[PDB]
Design a protein around this ligand. Structure first.
Ligand SMILES: Cc1noc(-c2c(NC(=O)[C@@H]3CCCC[C@@H]3C(=O)O)sc3c2CCCC3)n1
Length: 134
């Protein structure tokens, strides 16, 4: 058993709070924000040894990242930012820091009841995205 166990599986977006303002703060343009706003992505999380893979699959875009905890990696985000990402475990929370152009955003993923809750913070702006098992 590992702390990442509770995350593994296929998840589907069930609700989104303040996501348009989060995207604004990150610098996402109008057209991408409207398309993002409709999307109900799936998130597929798997583990093979030390390597964690998170796939995001939506009508617009399929993204995938594979990473080792604490090891920086290159990531192209859904909105096409080219960022330097580091994902660590803080207790049972996966903490994902993306850095680009002197800016930084933090995405936290945690299990709460039967949900996987994703808290996205950019400067003062927080968004919450709630996933359920698909
Ligand atoms: C920022 C941004 N710009 O476009 C996006 C973005 C997504 N964002 C997410 O899915 C959120 C946002 C940050 C981490 C993951 C979280 C998730 O629900 O898995 S999904 C999606 C887009 C752009 C258009 C295509 C579909 N994000």
């Amino acid at each position: 058993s590992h702390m990442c166990d509770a995350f593994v599986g296929t998840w589907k977006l069930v609700s989104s709070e303040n996501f348009d303002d989060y995207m604004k703060e990150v610098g996402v343009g109008f057209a991408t924000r409207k398309v993002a706003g409709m999307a109900k992505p799936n998130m597929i999380i798997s583990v093979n040894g030390d390597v964690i893979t998170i796939k995001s699959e939506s009508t617009f875009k399929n993204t995938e990242i594979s990473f080792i905890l604490g090891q920086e990696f290159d990531e192209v985000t859904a909105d096409d930012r080219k960022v330097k990402s580091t994902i660590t475990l803080d207790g049972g929370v996966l903490v994902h820091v993306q850095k680009w152009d002197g800016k930084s955003t933090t995405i936290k993923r945690k299990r709460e009841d039967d949900k996987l809750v994703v808290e996205c913070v950019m400067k003062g702006v927080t968004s919450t995205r709630v996933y359920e098992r698909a």
